[PDB]
Design a protein around this motif. Structure first.
Motif, PDB file in Angstrom:
ATOM      1  N   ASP A  29       2.727  16.762 -17.623  1.00  7.44           N
ATOM      2  CA  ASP A  29       3.949  15.488 -17.387  1.00  7.44           C
ATOM      3  C   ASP A  29       3.763  15.066 -16.101  1.00  7.44           C
ATOM      4  N   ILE A  30       3.563  13.502 -15.556  1.00  9.56           N
ATOM      5  CA  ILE A  30       3.675  13.572 -13.978  1.00  9.56           C
ATOM      6  C   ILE A  30       5.144  12.466 -14.291  1.00  9.56           C
ATOM      7  N   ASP A  31       5.839  13.715 -13.408  1.00 12.18           N
ATOM      8  CA  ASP A  31       6.737  14.052 -12.590  1.00 12.18           C
ATOM      9  C   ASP A  31       6.867  12.679 -11.346  1.00 12.18           C
ATOM     10  N   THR A  32       7.309  11.501 -11.673  1.00  9.25           N
ATOM     11  CA  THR A  32       6.832  10.169 -10.578  1.00  9.25           C
ATOM     12  C   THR A  32       7.749  10.848  -9.001  1.00  9.25           C
ATOM     13  N   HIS A  33       9.162  11.188  -9.208  1.00  4.94           N
ATOM     14  CA  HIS A  33       9.715  11.479  -8.362  1.00  4.94           C
ATOM     15  C   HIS A  33       9.333  13.007  -7.835  1.00  4.94           C
ATOM     16  N   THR A  34       9.213  14.153  -8.359  1.00  4.51           N
ATOM     17  CA  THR A  34       7.973  14.629  -7.593  1.00  4.51           C
ATOM     18  C   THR A  34       6.980  14.907  -6.510  1.00  4.51           C
ATOM     19  N   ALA A  35       6.219  13.398  -7.159  1.00  2.55           N
ATOM     20  CA  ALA A  35       4.634  13.958  -7.116  1.00  2.55           C
ATOM     21  C   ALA A  35       4.796  13.386  -5.254  1.00  2.55           C
ATOM     22  N   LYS A  36       3.637  13.919  -4.619  1.00  3.69           N
ATOM     23  CA  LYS A  36       4.047  13.722  -3.130  1.00  3.69           C
ATOM     24  C   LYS A  36       2.814  12.197  -2.449  1.00  3.69           C
ATOM     25  N   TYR A  37       3.587  11.545  -2.160  1.00  2.33           N
ATOM     26  CA  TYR A  37       2.813  10.795  -1.397  1.00  2.33           C
ATOM     27  C   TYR A  37       1.495  11.314  -0.395  1.00  2.33           C
ATOM     28  N   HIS A 104      -1.494  12.763 -20.536  1.00  4.19           N
ATOM     29  CA  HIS A 104      -0.459  12.587 -19.567  1.00  4.19           C
ATOM     30  C   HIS A 104       1.031  12.013 -20.365  1.00  4.19           C
ATOM     31  N   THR A 105       1.709  12.762 -19.945  1.00  4.42           N
ATOM     32  CA  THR A 105       2.621  11.162 -20.280  1.00  4.42           C
ATOM     33  C   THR A 105       3.664  11.234 -18.307  1.00  4.42           C
ATOM     34  N   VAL A 106       4.031   9.842 -18.443  1.00  3.24           N
ATOM     35  CA  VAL A 106       5.637   9.045 -16.460  1.00  3.24           C
ATOM     36  C   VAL A 106       6.624  10.021 -17.617  1.00  3.24           C
ATOM     37  N   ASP A 107       7.165  10.746 -16.506  1.00  3.82           N
ATOM     38  CA  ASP A 107       8.370  11.446 -16.612  1.00  3.82           C
ATOM     39  C   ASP A 107       8.701  10.911 -17.927  1.00  3.82           C
ATOM     40  N   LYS A 108       8.407  12.139 -18.507  1.00  2.05           N
ATOM     41  CA  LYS A 108       8.220  12.343 -20.022  1.00  2.05           C
ATOM     42  C   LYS A 108       7.315  11.265 -21.116  1.00  2.05           C
ATOM     43  N   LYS A 109       7.803   9.575 -20.415  1.00  2.00           N
ATOM     44  CA  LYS A 109       7.308   8.460 -21.005  1.00  2.00           C
ATOM     45  C   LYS A 109       5.663   8.901 -22.194  1.00  2.00           C
ATOM     46  N   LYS A 110       5.172   8.739 -23.001  1.00  2.26           N
ATOM     47  CA  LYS A 110       4.108   8.808 -23.232  1.00  2.26           C
ATOM     48  C   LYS A 110       3.870   7.437 -24.560  1.00  2.26           C
TER      49      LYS A 110
END
Ligand SMILES: Cc1cc(C)nc(Sc2c(F)c(F)c(S(N)(=O)=O)c(F)c2F)n1
Ligand SMILES: [Zn+2]
Length: 257
Positions: A29-37, A104-110
């Motif tokens: 899962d890609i947690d978009t808030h914690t991904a580092k720019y 992969h999911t994005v903030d748990k979104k499928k």
């Protein structure tokens, strides 16, 4: 033996492929808030103008559109990569329902499906030797959502009835994979693995932020494929996705925002 059912699906894979419980498995899962720019990540270079598709194949798990990878004709480089990776095939993972299907999911979104453009590092000379190496593959993952049709997908969808069952192939020349890419190449990237056995930990994942949209008629035609061979009882090729795996000691980097 392995597949996607109750008895041989993803939670079973570790028994044949112990690396299933490894330290860098995919998807995640890609947690978009914690991904580092990472402002030092470069734009992804997708150079598909000279792509040579050859064949399309139902291998019993998904269908692969294969390319001639015997010269630098369809290559991925830049982004997080060092050097040059050749496109060998793409395929998709999808659901029985529009609410699931992506790996992969994005903030748990499928998403309804996920396209994987698989590329191998030229410094290893071929795919089989690249998968043994930790920087051997670069897979470009693109999510599919259902909405308006993707015109560039329609030739793939239209050939599916010719490779309905496991082992079938068909000629598939002059397919242009540029027709499957969204407008933006903003991406997330992390080190992971193949998402099907042998689950080898050889992949730099590059997952685009922007999904493409495809029509319900297009993804319905994916769901008419079969995991079985001809003359075997019909098992619809649906839900051929591995669920998200533990991130463990990894950081997902973003090329944007
Ligand atoms: C050792 C070996 C040899 C060969 C010919 N194919 C593979 S397969 C493969 C795989 F297993 C995968 F999971 C993936 S993927 N879904 O995009 O993560 C892949 F692209 C692949 F090409 N592994
Ligand atoms: Zn895949």
């Amino acid at each position: 033996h392995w597949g996607y059912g109750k008895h041989n699906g993803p939670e079973h894979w570790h028994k044949d492929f112990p690396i299933a419980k490894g330290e860098r498995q995919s998807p995640v899962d890609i947690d978009t808030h914690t991904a580092k720019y990472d402002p030092s990540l470069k734009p992804l270079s997708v150079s598909y103008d000279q792509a040579t598709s050859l064949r399309i194949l139902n291998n019993g798990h998904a269908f692969n559109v294969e390319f001639d990878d015997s010269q630098d004709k369809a290559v991925l480089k830049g982004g997080p990569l060092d050097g040059t990776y050749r496109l060998i095939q793409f395929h998709f993972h999808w659901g029985s329902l529009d609410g699931q299907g992506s790996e992969h999911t994005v903030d748990k979104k499928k998403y309804a499906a996920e396209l994987h453009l698989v590329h191998w590092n030229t410094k290893y000379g071929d795919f089989g030797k690249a998968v043994q190496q930790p920087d051997g593959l670069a897979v470009l993952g693109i999510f599919l959502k259902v909405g308006s049709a993707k015109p560039g997908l329609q030739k793939v969808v239209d050939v599916l009835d010719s490779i309905k069952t496991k082992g079938k192939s068909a000629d598939f020349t002059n397919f242009d994979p540029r027709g499957l890419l969204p407008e933006s190449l903003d991406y997330w990237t992390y080190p992971g693995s193949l998402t099907t056995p042998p689950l080898l930990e050889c992949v730099t994942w590059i997952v685009l932020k922007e999904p493409i949209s495809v029509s319900s008629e297009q993804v319905l035609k994916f769901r008419k494929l079969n995991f079985n061979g001809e003359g075997e009882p019909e098992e619809l090729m649906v839900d051929n996705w591995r669920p998200a795996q533990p991130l463990k000691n990894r950081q997902i980097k973003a090329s944007f925002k």
